[PDB]
Each structure stands twice: as structure tokens, then as C-alpha cells.
């Protein structure tokens, strides 16, 4: 019962997935190939995966939407977040990208209305030090 | 999530065993021969629908009596 965030285009990573997947009896290769197929269909960004386990060692993968932080990074065009959030601003986002990510978080989340996800993403941008406009 | 179950062999035993090897890797002539003889092993579990029905078509073309929901 573990969850991870991992790059879409490559399987069998060294740091994150290897050991944690190993200590849980999950078959590494079958998960790698299925995730690679799904993420080649996706081809947008890295994807987070949750690992659910059974007594018969069968494994089920839970694939959510692309991470909100990464979506805000691609919307702001920058790669690395601001080292001093609210103290230096690296980029600015208009409400179109914020609302697209808000629809994404609506699809992935418990939010009743798109406004809730919009304010969630505005808070994420505040955390990064990225202005929402 | 689908589990494939084979019910018999028929008059085309050799082809059935070969195609059973083709569907699921790791089986030889003798191991799959014994499997289709009786040895009720659930070879593949939780496979996708396209894999299930392509295996169904291949096995039926091999002369095997297979059931896929």
C-alpha cells in the first residue's frame, strides 16, 4: 500500500519505484510495461501511481491525472520552481491555464465546483511563488 | 480483468498445445500437453478483453474448445 510519482516515458527507475515496489511482491516488469503503454498513450507529463496489493500477490495500478505542480510548471513555461516563493516571481499565469488545470483537478478530485479547484490551483501557485492573474 | 479457461483439446491436439504455448509464455510441448490433458491450471488472469478474445479466436482456430465471456 504505497503511492509514487514517476516519469511517464521511462520505466524501471533507479531511486523511487524500484525498492518500494520490490518489498511488496509486485511484479516489476508487467507493471513497467503496462504503465509505459498507458503513459505513451498519455504523452503529456509524468503521472502519479498508487499501488494496491492483494493476498494473491496480484497488483492493481491506480493512475491519476498529471500532477498539479507539474501542470502549473508547464503553464508558466518554467521548469524549476521559485526558490523564494512570494519573494521572487519567475512567471505569471492567466486564468485560462489555471482553469484548465482546475478542470483537471475537478476530474481527479472531490471538488463540487470548478471554482474550488481554481482556488486550489491559485493556492498551489502561491506556494510556488507564482502569480495567478 | 478476465481469466481464461480451456475446456478441451479435440482432434487437433498438437496445434492446440502449440497455440496455448503461443498465448502464454513459459510452457513447453510436454507441460502444455499435460495442461490440456487435465492439469487444470489458470494460465492467465486479469488480462484485457482484446487479449482474451484474440486468444479465443486463436484457440478456436487451433481446434480447441475455449470459453471467453
Amino acid at each position: 500500500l504505497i503511492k509514487l510519482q514517476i516519469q511517464a516515458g521511462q520505466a524501471n527507475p533507479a531511486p523511487p519505484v524500484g525498492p518500494a515496489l520490490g518489498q511488496h511482491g509486485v511484479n516489476i516488469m508487467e507493471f513497467c510495461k503496462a504503465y509505459n503503454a498507458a503513459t505513451e498513450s498519455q504523452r503529456g507529463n509524468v503521472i502519479p501511481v498508487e499501488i494496491t496489493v492483494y493476498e494473491d500477490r496480484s497488483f492493481t495500478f491506480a493512475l491519476k491525472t498529471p500532477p498539479a505542480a507539474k501542470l502549473l510548471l508547464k503553464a508558466a513555461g518554467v521548469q524549476k520552481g521559485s526558490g523564494e516563493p512570494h519573494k521572487t516571481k519567475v512567471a505569471k499565469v492567466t486564468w485560462d491555464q489555471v482553469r484548465e488545470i482546475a478542470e483537471t483537478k475537478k476530474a481527479d478530485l472531490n471538488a463540487n465546483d470548478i471554482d474550488a479547484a481554481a482556488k486550489i490551483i491559485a493556492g498551489t501557485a502561491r506556494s510556488m511563488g507564482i502569480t495567478v492573474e | 480483468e478476465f481469466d481464461v479457461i480451456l475446456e478441451g483439446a479435440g482432434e487437433k491436439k498438437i496445434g492446440v498445445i502449440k497455440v496455448v504455448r503461443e498465448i502464454v509464455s513459459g510452457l513447453g510441448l510436454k507441460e502444455a500437453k499435460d495442461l490440456v490433458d487435465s492439469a487444470p491450471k489458470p494460465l492467465l488472469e486479469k488480462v484485457t478483453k482484446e487479449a482474451a478474445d484474440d486468444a479465443k479466436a486463436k484457440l478456436e482456430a487451433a481446434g480447441a474448445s475455449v470459453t471467453v465471456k
Binding site: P13, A14, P15, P19, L21, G22, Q23, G25 | -
Partner: protein
């Protein structure tokens, strides 16, 4: 006893017995030979009356550290009992034992389970394609559980491992075993082997075991219909089942389990029958591939005395009176007394792949580094090794393992064949020692004979990599651990009588600068007539690693005739070599010099004046500025399970090991890459075996130099 005589390889078995430290292989071999008539009564290494454990160090450490061969032919089939060391520090000895045999036997304890070193042993024994039959011993112990060990074996190394003989006894002094395929229980309540059909106490369990064994053997056997007939109401013929079991063993895919009461001799006769019938014949066995001298492919030779000659020396001994006796692993051809064969040193170009710093290929011996040799020699005295005694034999047919005395060039792995068509059998995996230990020769004769002694040691143990450092002129010995180093030192101080002195390992270090500096070099030396007056000014700055030494001359006006500037450069180079760190410098590397001033006189100052001027100029420049001491860093390969990832890499914080990635080998095993300076890698073998509990190995590859902090 009687000399085992066979005239055909199919009547010869080459079995390299393997097991853990504390395996009891020597006692089992003694029991097997006592059954076969070689020995009247079985000896124990605790008393010291055994055969295989003949070496002094084996008795000294009470465990087999050196391999041995015991020959015994029963039911017309020659069986070669090759005992092999089980310690991790002697992995090469067991590797050579496997490489010089057509079968392997795993002898383990019934009261103890399988540990990681024995798991690694099984892993290595798999990647040689050797049929491994499981032997369960130490049945006398109160804690002995054959069933638990068999269950663990069936759990770990797949379900293919299936028991062949099921013991019947109290678990302490077992009264015998049950023949499954033969339907015949062998009782020993009277101390004698009585093959009889079982009384029926576990007849249902006997039938279950027979059916399981039959399914395990037939499913691999060629005839698919055999299982159908067995399930169709017909009991399979006994001869057909025995043939199927033999064929299944021949594929190196089946692992029968044969518990033996090595304490009482129960299990010996049945195990001998198993060897005689089920074991693959050397002609049917996958012989090592045979190479032509220049590398062109050649088909492996037919395992027949009638066929072309083929053999291989894999051991070497010593004796005051007689001389050297070397084991020979014969694959093909007929060996006859007073014949001439080819002695080939592996054609070391084949083993020239990598080799770490020392580039060890075969038998090393820096004076004669790498074997790579072709020698034609008359053979000495034929003999069959039985402990310290050697039983002579007239003829050696193909597939048999023999030993010839009175030899001079023979080395471990030296392929023997016809001198007109010489051959190089494929060298087995040669483990590089990773614990370099420095020694110093007390007297001159000590090291003068040390070359011969180390060449002999390589002829016995090629895993000892030797490389004498030229920088400090101190011989450096590489070993695999405390056991390997102890064995090497014992043999050195005993087998050739050499006094030794162990000293600290020395590793070098360099000099480079930290920034731009200027230097002034003046030479004045009264002569009376033509002057000796040179005033040179230089400018030296550091250079990046590998960028070499750069010299620039910018004397304005050309006061120095151009034949004196090379003397200035020579003095600069001499100052670089001597060093500039205080008064005890080191050779300066990777700096650029800019000589921008000079003066000269022609008649007197040929070279020396300007050499001294340049040395003083560089001293003035380098003393004014800073400097750095450069030490080396290496790439380290570490593969430990997911649980040892933290326990290792947190300790690397104290050991300055910077990780690059924890690559996932599969589920648990994780591949770790880190660059660690060789300072911390001095004693890493012992530390590694400590923290990983004898479940850790490593690799080392020199990467570059780094400044010292």
C-alpha cells in the same frame, strides 16, 4: 584399496562435491570410499585420519580450504569424488573444481537451513550448466530435519527439486531410506543394507512421492505420452522410469534429493547407484569449448580415448624428494606413459578482458605476467591422487581425471593436447581478489624464490593476483579476505619456506596549483672570466586534470641563446618532479609555465646553471601561491537488497560515498553506484562482510584523481 580402472568415459564420472563451510563432505567421501573398498574404515577430520583433508592448513583451520580428488569405480563406472572448499574466500577453487568436472553435488546440513553464501554458490553452480543433486547430511544431530530442508529447497529453487529417496528413521539415527522408483525400502536396523519392499507404514505417502517424482521427471522427459499412460490406469515400467530419471539428470534441469547418514554409512550405496545410473556421461556431458591457438572456432573434441588428445591441468603440488605433482582434467584422447603433450597458458589474450588495475589474465606472476605460453614437455609419472598418496595408473582414458608428477611448467587451467594441434579450453570465471595487502621481503633470497613460489601458487590458486608496485618497489599481494590471505601466507611460509613481513599498502598522490603565480630565478656563480649570470622570471598557473604540462618562453630581447632554454625547461621539470609543498613535495602535475625573462652567458653555463635557475624560479613561484594534494577516486559497484540500501548508504556518509542511483535489479536486489576515494576502500572487504553479514560483494574501477580536503 584397489585402483579404480575404467576404459571408457561413459564409465567415468567427474563429480565436484560442493557445500557450505561446515558441510561434512570429507566424512561423506570417506564413507563412500569405505563402501567402495578404497578405505577399510571411515576417518574423521577431527581425528585427522581422512583422505581429502590432507593439507596442513585444512587440519589447522578444521575446514576444507584446498580442493581434493578421490577416485572410486563401482558397478563398472568410475566416480571421481572432488571435494571443494565452501568458504567465500575460495570461490575460485570451487569454480575450478566445477570447470574440471561433469557433475556437482550439493552437500548441506539437515539441522541448519540455507544461508546467503550457499545461495550464491547455487547461483554460480547454475550458470555452468551442471546437474546438481541435493544431498542431505548431518542426520545424526538431534535437530536434524530432512523434510524441512527439502521443503526449503522446493520453495527456493523452484518445484523442480524433487526427492528421490525418502528416509525412514527416528530423525536422530535413521534406520534407512525408501526407494520410490524402485518401491524398495532399505533398512539398517541391523547395520546392514537390506533392499526390501517397504512394510507399508507410509504406503500411501510412498505412492504420493512416486507420483510426484514421476510427474517431475516425465514432464521434462521426451515422451509426452508417458504421463497420460501413468494416469490412464497403467503403472509405468520401472526401466522406463529409471531411463527417464537418468535423461532428466542429463539435462542439468532436475535436482534429486538424496539424504545420507554420513555418520553410519546409510545412504552411501544408494547414492553410489544414483551416480552410476542417473549421472550424465562425459561424452553426453557438455564439455567446455576448445579454442584454436589464434582464435578460429573449433568443434569441442569427442570424449573418446580413440579420439584426439585433450586434457587440462588444474592443480599443482610440491614435494622435497619427488617433485611437483599436478592434477590433469582429461576430456579426450588417450594419455600414455612417456608421451609429449602441449602445455598452453590459456592464450592469455582470451583472458585479457579488463582485469581492474592489475589486468590479471592467467597465473599473473609479473616477471612472466599472464600465462599466454605454449610449452611442449615430456610427461613424468602417472598417478591417481588419494590424499598425500598418489596411485600410479598405466593408461588414462578420456574423461578421467589423473595427476602426473615431475612437472615444471604445469599451471591451473593449462589445456593439454597434441603438440601438433594445440588447444586452449575455455578458461572458467576467474575471480579477481579485491583486498590488496602489501608485504616486504626480509632477505634477498626470500623474494628471489618468491617469484617461483607465486608462480607455483598461481599453478595451484590462480585467484591470487600479484602486482609489484614499481613506484615504491614493494610487492603487493591481492586476496579475497582473511581466509584467502591466511592460506596464502601459510603456504608461503611452509610450502616454499619464505619468511615474510607484512607492511602497509602504499597509494600515491600528486601536486597541482590553486591560481596564477610568478617566479624569479637567478643564477650567480663566480668564475673569473666569462660570466655565469642568469636572471630568469617565470609565471606558472594550474591546468585542468589531464591537460599536461605547458611551457611558454617569452624572454624579451633574446639575451639567452636558444640552446639554453631547454636547460631552463629541464630545471622546471626537475622542480616539478621533486615537489613544492614545503620541503617534502610530490611530483607536480597539470600546470602551465610562462618564462617571460632571462639572461645568459655562452661559454660556461651549458645546462646546469639554467636548470638550477629554473628550479629556484619555480620554487619562488609555487611557494608564493597555494597548492593542492591530489588523491584518487574510483567507481564502486554495490548490489545489496532493498533492506541493506539504507544500512549501507548511511554508513557511506561516514565513508564519503556519494550515491548516483539505486538501480532496481529485480524486486529486492538493488544496483548502487557511488564514487569513493581509495582511502576508504582500504579495508572495505571486511567491513562489507560485517555490515552485510557475509552477503555483500563489490567492484572497483579507478576513475580519476581529486584534491584532498
Amino acid at each position: 584399496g584397489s585402483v579404480p580402472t575404467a576404459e571408457r568415459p561413459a564409465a567415468i564420472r567427474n563429480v565436484a562435491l560442493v557445500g557450505p563451510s561446515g558441510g561434512g563432505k570429507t566424512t561423506l567421501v570417506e564413507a563412500l570410499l569405505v563402501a567402495g573398498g578404497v578405505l577399510t574404515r571411515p576417518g574423521s577430520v577431527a581425528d585427522g585420519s581422512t583422505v581429502c583433508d590432507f593439507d596442513e592448513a585444512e587440519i589447522a583451520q578444521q575446514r576444507s580450504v584446498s580442493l581434493a580428488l578421490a577416485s572410486l569405480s563401482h558397478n563398472g563406472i568410475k566416480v571421481n569424488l572432488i571435494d571443494t572448499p565452501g568458504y567465500a574466500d575460495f570461490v575460485g577453487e570451487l569454480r575450478a573444481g566445477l570447470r574440471a568436472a561433469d557433475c556437482a553435488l550439493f552437500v548441506i546440513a539437515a539441522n541448519e537451513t540455507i544461508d546467503e553464501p550457499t545461495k550464491t554458490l547455487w547461483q554460480e553452480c547454475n550458470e555452468v550448466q551442471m546437474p546438481r543433486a541435493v544431498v542431505i547430511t548431518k542426520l545424526d544431530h538431534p535437530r536434524a530435519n530432512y523434510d524441512a530442508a527439502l521443503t526449503a529447497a522446493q520453495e527456493a529453487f523452484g518445484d523442480k527439486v524433487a526427492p528421490l529417496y525418502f528416509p525412514v528413521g527416528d530423525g536422530e539415527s535413521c534406520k534407512g531410506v525408501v526407494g520410490l522408483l524402485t518401491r524398495t525400502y532399505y533398512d539398517y536396523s541391523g547395520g546392514t543394507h537390506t533392499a526390501r519392499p517397504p512394510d507399508g507404514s507410509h504406503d500411501a505417502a510412498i505412492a504420493e512421492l512416486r507420483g510426484s517424482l514421476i510427474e517431475g521427471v516425465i514432464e521434462e522427459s521426451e515422451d509426452e505420452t508417458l504421463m497420460e499412460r501413468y494416469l490412464g490406469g497403467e503403472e509405468i515400467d520401472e526401466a522406463v522410469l529409471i531411463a527417464d530419471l537418468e535423461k532428466a539428470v542429463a539435462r542439468a534441469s532436475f535436482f534429486p534429493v538424496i539424504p545420507v547418514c554420513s555418520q553410519s554409512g546409510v545412504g552411501t550405496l544408494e547414492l553410489l547407484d544414483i551416480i552410476s545410473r542417473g549421472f550424465p556421461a562425459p561424452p553426453e556431458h557438455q564439455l567446455p569449448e576448445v579454442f584454436t591457438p589464434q582464435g578460429a572456432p573449433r568443434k569441442p573434441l569427442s570424449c573418446d580415448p580413440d579420439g584426439p588428445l585433450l586434457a587440462e591441468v588444474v592443480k599443482t603440488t610440491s614435494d622435497p624428494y619427488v617433485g611437483r605433482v599436478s592434477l590433469v582434467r582429461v576430456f579426450s584422447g588417450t594419455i600414455r606413459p612417456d608421451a609429449t603433450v602441449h602445455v598452453s597458458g590459456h592464450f592469455s589474450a582470451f583472458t585479457d578482458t579488463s582485469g581492474s588495475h592489475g589486468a590479471a589474465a592467467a597465473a599473473d606472476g609479473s616477471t612472466h605476467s599472464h600465462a599466454d605460453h605454449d610449452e611442449d614437455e615430456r610427461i613424468g609419472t602417472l598417478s591417481f591422487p588419494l590424499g598425500k598418496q598418489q596411485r600410479p595408473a598405466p593408461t588414462v582414458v578420456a574423461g578421467d581425471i589423473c595427476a602426473i608428477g615431475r612437472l615444471s611448467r604445469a599451471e591451473t587451467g593449462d589445456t593439454l593436447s597434441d603438440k601438433t594441434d594445440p588447444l586452449v579450453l575455455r578458461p572458467w570465471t576467474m575471480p579477481d581478489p579485491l583486498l590488496p595487502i602489501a608485504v616486504a621481503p626480509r632477505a634477498k633470497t626470500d623474494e628471489d624464490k618468491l617469484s617461483v613460489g607465486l608462480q607455483r601458487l598461481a599453478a595451484e590458486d590462480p585467484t591470487l593476483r600479484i602486482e609489484q608496485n614499481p613506484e615504491t618497489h614493494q610487492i603487493v599481494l591481492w586476496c579475497m579476505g582473511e581466509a584467502h590471505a591466511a592460506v596464502v601466507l601459510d603456504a608461503l611460509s611452509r610450502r616454499y619456506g619464505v619468511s615474510v613481513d607484512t607492511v602497509e599498502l602504499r597509494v600515491p598522490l600528486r601536486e597541482t596549483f590553486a591560481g596564477k603565480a610568478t617566479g624569479h630565478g637567478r643564477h650567480v656563480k663566480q668564475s673569473g672570466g666569462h660570466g655565469q649570470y642568469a636572471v630568469c622570471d617565470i609565471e606558472v598557473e594550474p591546468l585542468p586534470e589531464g591537460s599536461g604540462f605547458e611551457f611558454v618562453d617569452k624572454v624579451v630581447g633574446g639575451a639567452v641563446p636558444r640552446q639554453f632554454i631547454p636547460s631552463v625547461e629541464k630545471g622546471v621539470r626537475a622542480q616539478m618532479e621533486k615537489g613544492v609543498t614545503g620541503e617534502s613535495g610530490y611530483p607536480v602535475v597539470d600546470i602551465r609555465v610562462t618564462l617571460f625573462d632571462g639572461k645568459a652567458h655562452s661559454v660556461d653555463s651549458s645546462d646546469f646553471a639554467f636548470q638550477m635557475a629554473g628550479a629556484l624560479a619555480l620554487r619562488d613561484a609555487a611557494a608564493a601561491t597555494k597548492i593542492n594534494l591530489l588523491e584518487p577516486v574510483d567507481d564502486v559497484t554495490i548490489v545489496v537488497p532493498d533492506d541493506l540500501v539504507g544500512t549501507i548508504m548511511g554508513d557511506l556518509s561516514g565513508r564519503r560515498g556519494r550515491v548516483l542511483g539505486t538501480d532496481k535489479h529485480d524486486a529486492d536486489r538493488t544496483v548502487i553506484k557511488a564514487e569513493i576515494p581509495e582511502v576508504e576502500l582500504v579495508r572495505y572487504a571486511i567491513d562489507l562482510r560485517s555490515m552485510s553479514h557475509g552477503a555483500g560483494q563489490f567492484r572497483r574501477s579507478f576513475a580519476r584523481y581529486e584534491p584532498m580536503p
